[PDB]
Amino acid sequence: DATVYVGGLDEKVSEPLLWELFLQAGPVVNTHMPKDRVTGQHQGYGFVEFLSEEDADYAIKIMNMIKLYGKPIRVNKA
Amino acid sequence: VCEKCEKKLGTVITPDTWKDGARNTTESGGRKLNENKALTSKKARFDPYGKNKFSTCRICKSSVHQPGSHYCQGCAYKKGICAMCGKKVLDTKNYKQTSV
Amino acid sequence: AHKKAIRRATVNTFGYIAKAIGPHDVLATLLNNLKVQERQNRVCTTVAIAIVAETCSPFTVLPALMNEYRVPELNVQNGVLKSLSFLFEYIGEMGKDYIYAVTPLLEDALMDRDLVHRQTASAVVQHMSLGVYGFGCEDSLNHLLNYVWPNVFETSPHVIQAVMGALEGLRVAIGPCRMLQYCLQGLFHPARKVRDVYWKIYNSIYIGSQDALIAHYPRIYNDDKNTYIRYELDYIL
Amino acid sequence: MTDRYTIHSQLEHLQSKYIGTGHADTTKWEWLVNQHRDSYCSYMGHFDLLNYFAIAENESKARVRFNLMEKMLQPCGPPAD
Amino acid sequence: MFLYNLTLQRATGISFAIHGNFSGTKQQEIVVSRGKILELLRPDPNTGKVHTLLTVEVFGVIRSLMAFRLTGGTKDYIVVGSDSGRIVILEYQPSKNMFEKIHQETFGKSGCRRIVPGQFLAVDPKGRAVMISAIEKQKLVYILNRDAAARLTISSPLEAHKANTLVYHVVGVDVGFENPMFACLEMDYEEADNDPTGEAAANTQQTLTFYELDLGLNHVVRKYSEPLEEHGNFLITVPGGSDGPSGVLICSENYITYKNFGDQPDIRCPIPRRRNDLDDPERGMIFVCSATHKTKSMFFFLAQTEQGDIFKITLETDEDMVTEIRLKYFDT
Amino acid sequence: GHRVIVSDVQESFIWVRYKRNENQLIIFADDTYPRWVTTASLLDYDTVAGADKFGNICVVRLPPNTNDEVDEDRGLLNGASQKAEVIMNYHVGETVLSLQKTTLIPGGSESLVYTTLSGGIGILVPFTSHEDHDFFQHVEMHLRSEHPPLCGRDHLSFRSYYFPVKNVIDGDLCEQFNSMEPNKQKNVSEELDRTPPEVSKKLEDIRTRYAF
Amino acid sequence: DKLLVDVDESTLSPEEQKERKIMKLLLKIKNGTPPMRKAALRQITDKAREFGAGPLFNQILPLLMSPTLEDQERHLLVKVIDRILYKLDDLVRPYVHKILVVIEPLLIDEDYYARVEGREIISNLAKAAGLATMISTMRPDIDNMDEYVRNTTARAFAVVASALGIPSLLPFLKAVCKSKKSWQARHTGIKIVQQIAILMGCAILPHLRSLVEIIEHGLVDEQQKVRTISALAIAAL
Amino acid sequence: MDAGFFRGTSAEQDNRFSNKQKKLLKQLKFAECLEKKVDMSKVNLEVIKPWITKRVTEILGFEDDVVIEFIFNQLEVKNPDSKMMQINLTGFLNGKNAREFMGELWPLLLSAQENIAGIPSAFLEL
Amino acid sequence: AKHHPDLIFCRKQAGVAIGRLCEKCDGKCVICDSYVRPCTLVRICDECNYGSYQGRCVICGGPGVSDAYYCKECTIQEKDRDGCPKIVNLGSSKTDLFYERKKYG
Amino acid sequence: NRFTVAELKQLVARPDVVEMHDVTAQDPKLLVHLKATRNSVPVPRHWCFKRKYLQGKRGIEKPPFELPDFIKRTGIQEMREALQEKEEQKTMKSKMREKVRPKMGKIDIDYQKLHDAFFKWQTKPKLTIHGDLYYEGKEFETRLKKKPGDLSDELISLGMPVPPPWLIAMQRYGPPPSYPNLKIPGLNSPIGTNAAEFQTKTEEEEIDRTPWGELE
Ligand SMILES: [Zn+2]
Ligand SMILES: [Zn+2]
Ligand SMILES: [Zn+2]
Ligand SMILES: [Zn+2]
Ligand SMILES: [Zn+2]
Known part of the structure; x- marks a missing residue:
């Protein structure tokens, strides 16, 4: 579960902000939030590697708490 | 500078290779053993608070580059004088000094 | 010139001239000369930059020399580093006034990919280290030790002796205790490679400061048949 | 290989000159015997470390110095081979 | 946070004291070492009160101190060994009231190192040489002389080095005007570090070795070497030449021993213990300090034990050699 | 307050905070050097002065950002996560067993008094201006070369026996101005731009307004 | 000549390819341009132990025996010898005497720097082989029938005494000066003492009474050359 | 300059070479008994000499007075170092003959110092 | 020198002889080879001023014309305490130069 | 003849420092003792890397x-x-x-x-304080990782008066398993009684903050 997939985001959101968003729940050890080079903008889906299982199990619940720019965010195991 | 003002000159850190009449060799005594650089720092160098503050030429008012000089290089060359005291070191009646 | 005395008389003359027409006209000429290919020209130009820097105080020639480090040419960048090395050697104790200025330049050079950039920066650290001895500049020097120290596993001899010179300068400026704290973990490391390099740093600290290390050794516990605790220091009055 | 052997000759040269430099194969016992003996010499040298030890044990200083000199022979027990 | 240091009361404990004619006159002074300070004390004979004449701070650790006279000399010089890695020779100037450094000779690195000399300091009783040695494997002899303007001159050091060897004490032997001798309480730890069983540590023994400075050949030679029965802790120079026999008194635990090189057999006297003593019976007894009183007539030693008991020690000479040591309770 | 400063026998100072409503003692800061501590005294809420067996005094301060709100893994360098800065080192020369911050004379200022094992008593007095601090530093640097120690030792090397000397002017060396020769006193006092009575007066003023 | 014929490397044995490799390197050291000479020099130094002390010396030593050397080529060859003498420090024992008869002539060369580099390579050879090997090897040359060999052996013992020290070979030297079968050996031993005093200078003083007692019986000898050399040895001491 | 200044480096100065005497004290295999200390004042030498002469003469296959007198000269000091003597003879003799040679000369000197007369046992017998 | 790794110092116990420097070497430090800030006077061991050699250059060996000093940095690091700083071997560079000129000239 | 990592880790006083190769040491007990001593800085990490130091594509x-x-x-x-x-x-x-x-x-x-x-x-x-050795990636991996109960100003995006919106659900769903000791108001922390913040106020009143010996 150490990693989660996160959908439905707005490009003003940032990886550093994202790390602080999910570390509100529990620390994101490895952050991945693609920067698309071609048009220089984000599609808004994320992958998160944690310390161990602990971060992963919480992950799905952490999704409900999240609400970026008046919108929700998908979090599921991976 | 003139001959009495040469004690006011600064020295180069490395010793001169022509040893005679040098001011910065060990034998001359101007390069002293166990020098503390912090104690001899303000000697013959600019010090805005100290005694040698940033001066300008008395004639042209442009800034000199040597501590304790009252005349800038060009004005001292043209009038024939020592840059520090203003005593004349050259008789320039027959010399059309050319700044070029 | 081939004869060295001609070259050192020439360098001196640059400082005397800069006292008359000012350090900037002289310094621009000398900085332009660093693009030359042959090393004898460039090393002497480097010494002359330091000569003028010392005779006309370093706040005059510092800004332009530090600006020249951004020029995208290798010899110019090695050249500026080389003349800072001579400069700190020349000004001595007076170099506590500019150590904060040139600390970020040196930590940029010590992170550099070129090995030479690292050996000249280590020479600058050696000479700057011994000048500020006794003056409370140990935070800059300890910061620069964090950059100098990973270069101990270099194998090229010129770079390897510049690093060792830097560490021997740092021992007398930030103390034997810090230098022992750096060595400690690798003196008994499994690889001979890490071990003998570490042991030859330890020997240099030991030779130079054998007496001061008495207070700084760690506590080794007793094993089954040998006792290793220094019990006298553990005494309480 | 040859560089190993030249390092070895250089370090045994050092060790003869300054007693108590190590090399890559210093054992624990050797390093600690050196720093014990250096400690003892340092205690003898400084007057107030020797005062402190002569007060903490109720001994006279001559007895203290003589016991430290006795400990210099085998400071950390017998050699571990 | 810039601080300034001041000393209100200087150190008062005493590490070394030497007595001599330092002022150059009839009067006798004492030069005391207070560890970090060197002081000159002159005690009044009629009044009996001690007066402090000089007190100078030397910024170092004074590790040994001796007094030194040149041959036919009135004033005495002070020879200081310290942690500075150099040996200095000082002369008191009464008109100026300051010590004056006469010589400073550099031999080693600074600090209280294990092999750099400075710990032990011994002078030749006639005044021709001085010998400075470290705790182990490093000794150096300096030859002292007078030029035609009566100024002190020093030579290059002559070295006597012996690896793996500990020195407990070094004293200069009073041979008359022969080649200067220096006696030592050496010990060799070389064998002991190569015995895993630990026997070689147990049965290695301290030796007394005599170094002779051969003034003809300008070099120091390790002449005589004799094992001792038990470990001594210091040595006393027996006055010799014309006055008394030339040997060394070795003080060891529970014993005082006279030894000399030659045909003289070693002479041992137990140290008297206190009658009905409350101490632990296992504890031995050593001497902590001594002093020699040399008159022109005769001489004796005053040696103090750990408990504070001062004994007179007097040697009885049957012609050339000594036959017994006599030992008498003086005071506490 | 609720801060505790523990002197380890060889691990130097440790700062521990006591929080009441958890009932626990929490290490929040320490030092980066091994130190054989003999005594300590608190200079303010953030500063500790200490002394070793080896004969040197240090002054350790706590950096301005540190909070003692630590709740009980990481640590730096096998120790606490916050480190204290050493802001003064000084080798006295003789083992100090007592530091105390006090005023000695009526109408004087405070000072840090220490008493050595050998029987000496000294003070460590703080400078109140830069002009004093520059004067005394220049007097010290002249005298280290003009009037070197009598047994062949270096003064900067002596006071930096175990750790480099930091922020202290040795006044025992400075008050040996008055023992120099008059040509040397005049030569030194030229570069301070003062006459030898003025130099003796400034050396005597600081002793007067702190001490005896 | 083996470089002239052309041959596949794989066909011949590892020994023969090793010696062909050494032959190419030596040609580049003798006749090369300074780039070739530098690279070949470096490679024969680094691969010296891998080659072995045997295969080097049986091709280096015939080149120094050639009747057509120039002194710069001789110099380059003995530079090769003392570079590899640091490498195989203990593997040169079977080759000690072979080096001496190719280097001892340099001790009497009329050129000063040849004389000094002959001394340095004999002192390095003494430190590499140790006293016992040196003593056994030079024992035969003391009573040799030619006075050339005796001359240069007496010169070389002085050098070996500088390196290893006089107390080491003072018993052997005493044994060679007392020997009453041959006066050539007595003459040669006293000549060694003379040469030690000329070379060592001040160093011989701590042994002066050991040295004179070896020479005293020669002043009264029945052979007149021996009396002359004893007087010359006394004057040197 | 009467000679050149440069004469080579001594072994105390030059770290490029290892100490060959210590190295040989490690790797040669010495005889069993050479650790016992000998005092030569307690030994009579000229009675020991003809046996040595004969022993070296038959080992060598001829007579070499330099090897003879070298062996004798090493025995002149008060405490003769036996291990150095076996090393110093190893070059001349086989190194196997040197080991045997010390292995019989050394207990003979031990027997000589135990005697009052200075003479070892096998020579008192005969 | 610091520029030649194969050169070797004497390092015996230094004495009362003052070491000197030839015109070529004038003003430089014997150890680290610098031109600035001279701190202490160089002493050489007895053997190194024996006889004819009395008064030659410490660093190269030519006729000495002035006294040799250690610099300030070698004093602070106590490099001035290691021994006699006389160079005892010519080295490869000096020898090569001789044979090269002699070949040509 | 040699320890495996588990016996070594139990034999240390502190088992977090032991690595794979420490057992290959000639004296592994002393090595792991020295690695766990205070204020010593570790061996530079690239000693085992095949690529040369600082010679990397970034x-x-x-x-x-x-x-x-x-x-x-x-x-x-x-x-x-x-x-x-x-x-x-x-x-x-x-x-x-x-x-x-x-x-x-x-x-x-x-x-x-x-x-x-x-x-x-x-x-x-x-x-940088002592022991902070430079390594090659260092200046990019300098972002670090901010703990729950501590929020950034920007995380403004919530725009909520000051408790956390998520908590209204953490009390519902439970305390997260990953954090065993975490404390948040309303669940197991005072918004019992709330006298914890009063302690800090009282202490903060108690302190004098006047640095001794500074310049005037
Ligand atoms: Zn003008
Ligand atoms: Zn003028
Ligand atoms: Zn020269
Ligand atoms: Zn230098
Ligand atoms: Zn020398």
Whole structure:
């Protein structure tokens, strides 16, 4: 579960902000939030590697708490 | 500078290779053993608070580059004088000094 | 010139001239000369930059020399580093006034990919280290030790002796205790490679400061048949 | 290989000159015997470390110095081979 | 946070004291070492009160101190060994009231190192040489002389080095005007570090070795070497030449021993213990300090034990050699 | 307050905070050097002065950002996560067993008094201006070369026996101005731009307004 | 000549390819341009132990025996010898005497720097082989029938005494000066003492009474050359 | 300059070479008994000499007075170092003959110092 | 020198002889080879001023014309305490130069 | 003959430092004792890497050095930039002709400004405490990782009056398993009684903060 997939985001959101968003729940050890080079903008889906299982199990619940720019965010195991 | 003002000159850190009449060799005594650089720092160098503050030429008012000089290089060359005291070191009646 | 005395008389003359027409006209000429290919020209130009820097105080020639480090040419960048090395050697104790200025330049050079950039920066650290001895500049020097120290596993001899010179300068400026704290973990490391390099740093600290290390050794516990605790220091009055 | 052997000759040269430099194969016992003996010499040298030890044990200083000199022979027990 | 240091009361404990004619006159002074300070004390004979004449701070650790006279000399010089890695020779100037450094000779690195000399300091009783040695494997002899303007001159050091060897004490032997001798309480730890069983540590023994400075050949030679029965802790120079026999008194635990090189057999006297003593019976007894009183007539030693008991020690000479040591309770 | 400063026998100072409503003692800061501590005294809420067996005094301060709100893994360098800065080192020369911050004379200022094992008593007095601090530093640097120690030792090397000397002017060396020769006193006092009575007066003023 | 014929490397044995490799390197050291000479020099130094002390010396030593050397080529060859003498420090024992008869002539060369580099390579050879090997090897040359060999052996013992020290070979030297079968050996031993005093200078003083007692019986000898050399040895001491 | 200044480096100065005497004290295999200390004042030498002469003469296959007198000269000091003597003879003799040679000369000197007369046992017998 | 790794110092116990420097070497430090800030006077061991050699250059060996000093940095690091700083071997560079000129000239 | 990692880890006083290769040491007990001693800095990590130190593809794109701010206050960079931008336009003829007829007073900054840059505006840089060794990726991995119960100003996006919106659900769903000891108000922390914050107020009243011995 150490990693989660996160959908439905707005490009003003940032990886550093994202790390602080999910570390509100529990620390994101490895952050991945693609920067698309071609048009220089984000599609808004994320992958998160944690310390161990602990971060992963919480992950799905952490999704409900999240609400970026008046919108929700998908979090599921991976 | 003139001959009495040469004690006011600064020295180069490395010793001169022509040893005679040098001011910065060990034998001359101007390069002293166990020098503390912090104690001899303000000697013959600019010090805005100290005694040698940033001066300008008395004639042209442009800034000199040597501590304790009252005349800038060009004005001292043209009038024939020592840059520090203003005593004349050259008789320039027959010399059309050319700044070029 | 081939004869060295001609070259050192020439360098001196640059400082005397800069006292008359000012350090900037002289310094621009000398900085332009660093693009030359042959090393004898460039090393002497480097010494002359330091000569003028010392005779006309370093706040005059510092800004332009530090600006020249951004020029995208290798010899110019090695050249500026080389003349800072001579400069700190020349000004001595007076170099506590500019150590904060040139600390970020040196930590940029010590992170550099070129090995030479690292050996000249280590020479600058050696000479700057011994000048500020006794003056409370140990935070800059300890910061620069964090950059100098990973270069101990270099194998090229010129770079390897510049690093060792830097560490021997740092021992007398930030103390034997810090230098022992750096060595400690690798003196008994499994690889001979890490071990003998570490042991030859330890020997240099030991030779130079054998007496001061008495207070700084760690506590080794007793094993089954040998006792290793220094019990006298553990005494309480 | 040859560089190993030249390092070895250089370090045994050092060790003869300054007693108590190590090399890559210093054992624990050797390093600690050196720093014990250096400690003892340092205690003898400084007057107030020797005062402190002569007060903490109720001994006279001559007895203290003589016991430290006795400990210099085998400071950390017998050699571990 | 810039601080300034001041000393209100200087150190008062005493590490070394030497007595001599330092002022150059009839009067006798004492030069005391207070560890970090060197002081000159002159005690009044009629009044009996001690007066402090000089007190100078030397910024170092004074590790040994001796007094030194040149041959036919009135004033005495002070020879200081310290942690500075150099040996200095000082002369008191009464008109100026300051010590004056006469010589400073550099031999080693600074600090209280294990092999750099400075710990032990011994002078030749006639005044021709001085010998400075470290705790182990490093000794150096300096030859002292007078030029035609009566100024002190020093030579290059002559070295006597012996690896793996500990020195407990070094004293200069009073041979008359022969080649200067220096006696030592050496010990060799070389064998002991190569015995895993630990026997070689147990049965290695301290030796007394005599170094002779051969003034003809300008070099120091390790002449005589004799094992001792038990470990001594210091040595006393027996006055010799014309006055008394030339040997060394070795003080060891529970014993005082006279030894000399030659045909003289070693002479041992137990140290008297206190009658009905409350101490632990296992504890031995050593001497902590001594002093020699040399008159022109005769001489004796005053040696103090750990408990504070001062004994007179007097040697009885049957012609050339000594036959017994006599030992008498003086005071506490 | 609720801060505790523990002197380890060889691990130097440790700062521990006591929080009441958890009932626990929490290490929040320490030092980066091994130190054989003999005594300590608190200079303010953030500063500790200490002394070793080896004969040197240090002054350790706590950096301005540190909070003692630590709740009980990481640590730096096998120790606490916050480190204290050493802001003064000084080798006295003789083992100090007592530091105390006090005023000695009526109408004087405070000072840090220490008493050595050998029987000496000294003070460590703080400078109140830069002009004093520059004067005394220049007097010290002249005298280290003009009037070197009598047994062949270096003064900067002596006071930096175990750790480099930091922020202290040795006044025992400075008050040996008055023992120099008059040509040397005049030569030194030229570069301070003062006459030898003025130099003796400034050396005597600081002793007067702190001490005896 | 083996470089002239052309041959596949794989066909011949590892020994023969090793010696062909050494032959190419030596040609580049003798006749090369300074780039070739530098690279070949470096490679024969680094691969010296891998080659072995045997295969080097049986091709280096015939080149120094050639009747057509120039002194710069001789110099380059003995530079090769003392570079590899640091490498195989203990593997040169079977080759000690072979080096001496190719280097001892340099001790009497009329050129000063040849004389000094002959001394340095004999002192390095003494430190590499140790006293016992040196003593056994030079024992035969003391009573040799030619006075050339005796001359240069007496010169070389002085050098070996500088390196290893006089107390080491003072018993052997005493044994060679007392020997009453041959006066050539007595003459040669006293000549060694003379040469030690000329070379060592001040160093011989701590042994002066050991040295004179070896020479005293020669002043009264029945052979007149021996009396002359004893007087010359006394004057040197 | 009467000679050149440069004469080579001594072994105390030059770290490029290892100490060959210590190295040989490690790797040669010495005889069993050479650790016992000998005092030569307690030994009579000229009675020991003809046996040595004969022993070296038959080992060598001829007579070499330099090897003879070298062996004798090493025995002149008060405490003769036996291990150095076996090393110093190893070059001349086989190194196997040197080991045997010390292995019989050394207990003979031990027997000589135990005697009052200075003479070892096998020579008192005969 | 610091520029030649194969050169070797004497390092015996230094004495009362003052070491000197030839015109070529004038003003430089014997150890680290610098031109600035001279701190202490160089002493050489007895053997190194024996006889004819009395008064030659410490660093190269030519006729000495002035006294040799250690610099300030070698004093602070106590490099001035290691021994006699006389160079005892010519080295490869000096020898090569001789044979090269002699070949040509 | 040699320890495996588990026996070594139990035999240390502190088992977090032991690595795979420490068992290969000639004296592994002392090695792990020294690695767990205070204030010692570890061996640089690239000792085992096959690629050479700092010779890595990311290091190709390093930007030029930037001057500090107090030096850019002098205007040296604009002057010297303009100067070298003219000097690439000149031909070799023109450059060698102004070398015989020079031009004075060109690039001169007054001395007082240069002195003030060095003796008034100098600022100490960011420095690193002892044991903070540089390694190759360091300046990119310097983002670190901010703990629950501590929020950033920007995480403004919530726009909620000051408790957390998520908590209204953490009490519902439970305390997260990953954190065993975490404390948040309303679940197991006071918004019992709430006297914890009063303690900090009372102590903060108690303290004098006047640094001893500073300049006047
Ligand atoms: Zn003008
Ligand atoms: Zn004038
Ligand atoms: Zn020269
Ligand atoms: Zn230097
Ligand atoms: Zn020498």
